[PDB]
Amino acid sequence: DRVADVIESSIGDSVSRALTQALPAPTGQNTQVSSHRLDTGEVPALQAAEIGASSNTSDESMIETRCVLNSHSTAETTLDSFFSRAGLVGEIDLPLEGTTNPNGYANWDIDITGYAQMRRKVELFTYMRFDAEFTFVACTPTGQVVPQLLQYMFVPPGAPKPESRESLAWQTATNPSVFVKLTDPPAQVSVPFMSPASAYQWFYDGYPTFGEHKQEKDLEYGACPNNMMGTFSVRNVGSSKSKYPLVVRIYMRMKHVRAWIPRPMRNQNYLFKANPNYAGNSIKPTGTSRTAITTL
């Protein structure tokens, strides 16, 4: 009734065959007693790195070990323990006089790739899914706390970005906004995972649009819109110039973190936001160097 290669066919299997399983490991593995072993045929110490797998040799087979009941916790190395720590990811200036946002408002493009510490950590993984907690610390350039009322507004991509302090966009009929005084403790808020993808990508090896990819448009290489969450806008809630110069530091704490595919950790200094460019004339070694290989 039906061709055999179609019946016995396996095209369509949606379940991923996994060769490994995640086991409970709340503490470091214990060490078991070991005695001398003088025999042929069994060679724990000999490996073959070509295979691409790490050595499975254990302490017990290399030396005579005692019994150690290891009760050291492995909890502080979970993804949440590692990433759930607020760090600086943004900094906005609202000076009185200058060429940088001198009209009492600013539009910060949401991108946590502007600061090395936070950036290097997250770039340890290729993909990451998480909720976050944003905290906004505001004050003057001297650290002085001033009696000023500010308005922070999240402008998702597509919404109208304010063009002035008195822009109509500040009506926030739908965008989420926060009104705080610099005298109040830093505003804090919870953000969900808002990407149209299943996770954010710190690395996107491709282009966002089709067509010819000429020199002028190489600016778009590695730009993934699934990571472009919109803009963060700030302003003096008023219609006149503020009496003080302001600064807003943005901190981010990740929660409910999932991460996939680890990568080599940043080796060279960061230069730009949208890419991994490095100074070709100042390529420094990963670490420290010495005089001779036979001397410390």
Partner: protein, 244 residues
Amino acid sequence: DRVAQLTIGNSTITTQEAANIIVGYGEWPSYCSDDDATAVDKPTRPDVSVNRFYTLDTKLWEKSSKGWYWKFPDVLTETGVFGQNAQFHYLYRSGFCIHVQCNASKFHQGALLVAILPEYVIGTVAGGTGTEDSHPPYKQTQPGADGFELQHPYVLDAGIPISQLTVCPHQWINLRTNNCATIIVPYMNTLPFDSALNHCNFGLLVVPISPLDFDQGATPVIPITITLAPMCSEFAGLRQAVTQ
């Protein structure tokens, strides 16, 4: 365990000096679940006509070679029926079986690191000083089947250490031990399907960590050939053929 045969489609690979097989992240390629999918149109699963071994260009290993790389969905977009489907369809999905082969003699020596780096984004030297925001050209980000040579292998041309590249599915070709590396990669992306033209899921890196060497008289031409086969290929969103 040193010998092996890989048969898929109408192609068969043989080897008598292998070093087992690596299955990237401990997962075999599979088709897309009905709950992981979004595109509502029924996909095409050409099977045998696209899931077979394609042998791309050969490279010459010199005592001074730095290394090469190939972006993957890409290397095949202009070859066989796989390429045609990748051009006619908007969405593509698939795993790969990569087999890098390179043989010498019991008197030659050297070691190649063969690794798979997902989302392998290329960076530039930034004009040397690091003040110029330059970007890699299309010819370098998506080199095609001819692959591309690394200018600064130590940092993988992306500011990251090659010494840690082993956290990725890899294998070595140590001439005194084996003459090939086999790595099976599942479909990895944050989406169930994606464009085979605009996006390159991963990159294949073949880099000499221990320089090739031999005494004058032994054959000096030592090639490195790349053979690869798609697995569980699925395409959707049919239209006219698009090259890029």
